[PDB]
Design a protein around this ligand. Structure first.
Ligand code: CZH
Ligand code: NA
Length: 195
């Protein structure tokens, strides 16, 4: 049926591959290996660590911190509260549901704004475009994708602009499928760095 001006979107929140994916990332954020994380740690990872090592400007650093802050609050996190993976994953279920609704209605999403924040640190033209070399640097500083081979797979996997560079809107589409819905078209986005 035509759904009568609705669109049917698939989620896969009970698929073990989606659980493993976010479990992989939880462990990566759980640096002290105690099975708990805090919004405080995350925002400090964003500004005190990533943005400092990239040498983002103060305003660029604040925009990134605010987007990181708003994104993981979307998962039910709050500064001063430790959180464990099972409530982390349920937060992601809610975040993904609300984000997909806004995407379908052409409204701003937290994932897009986070992308805009990362790209603008690298892109001198302010057009949301980055190069393989810039992504490799982010992959190494954030730690999500330190392998150059994994980063090349990212550009191999995405559709690039006519000069071989990566647009923020392509990466946002990829991220919706990779983190929210387990779209098979997004498998391989980080090479072998992220399952
Ligand atoms: O998507 C991204 N990430 C997702 C998760 C993450 C964390 C936990 C999960 O359960 C799942 C995913 N963690 C980090 C790394 C990070 C985390 C916190 C603070 C700073 C950096 C991270 N960096 C991003 C930034 C990004 C965003 C949009 C773009 O268009 C391009 C790049 O690029 O991949
Ligand atoms: Na921890």
């Amino acid at each position: 049926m035509s759904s009568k001006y609705a669109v049917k979107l698939k989620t896969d929140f009970d698929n073990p591959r989606w659980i493993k994916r976010h479990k992989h990332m939880f462990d990566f954020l759980d640096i002290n290996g105690n099975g708990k994380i805090t919004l405080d740690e995350i925002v400090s990872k964003a500004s005190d660590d990533i943005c400092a090592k990239l040498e983002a400007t103060p305003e660029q650093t604040k925009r990134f911190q605010v987007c990181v802050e708003a994104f993981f609050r979307g998962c039910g996190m709050e500064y001063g509260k430790e959180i464990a993976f099972p409530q982390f994953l349920d937060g992601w279920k809610q975040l993904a549901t609300s984000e997909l609704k806004k995407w379908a209605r052409n409204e701003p999403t937290l994932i897009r704004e986070w992308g805009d924040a990362v790209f603008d640190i690298f892109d001198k033209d302010g057009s949301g475009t980055i190069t393989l070399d810039e992504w490799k640097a982010y992959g190494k500083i954030s730690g999500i994708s330190p392998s150059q081979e994994d980063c090349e797979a990212t550009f191999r996997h995405c559709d690039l602009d006519n000069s071989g560079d990566l647009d923020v809107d392509e990466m946002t589409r990829q991220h919706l499928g990779f983190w929210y819905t387990l779209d098979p078209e997004a498998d391989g986005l980080y090479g072998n760095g992220v399952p």
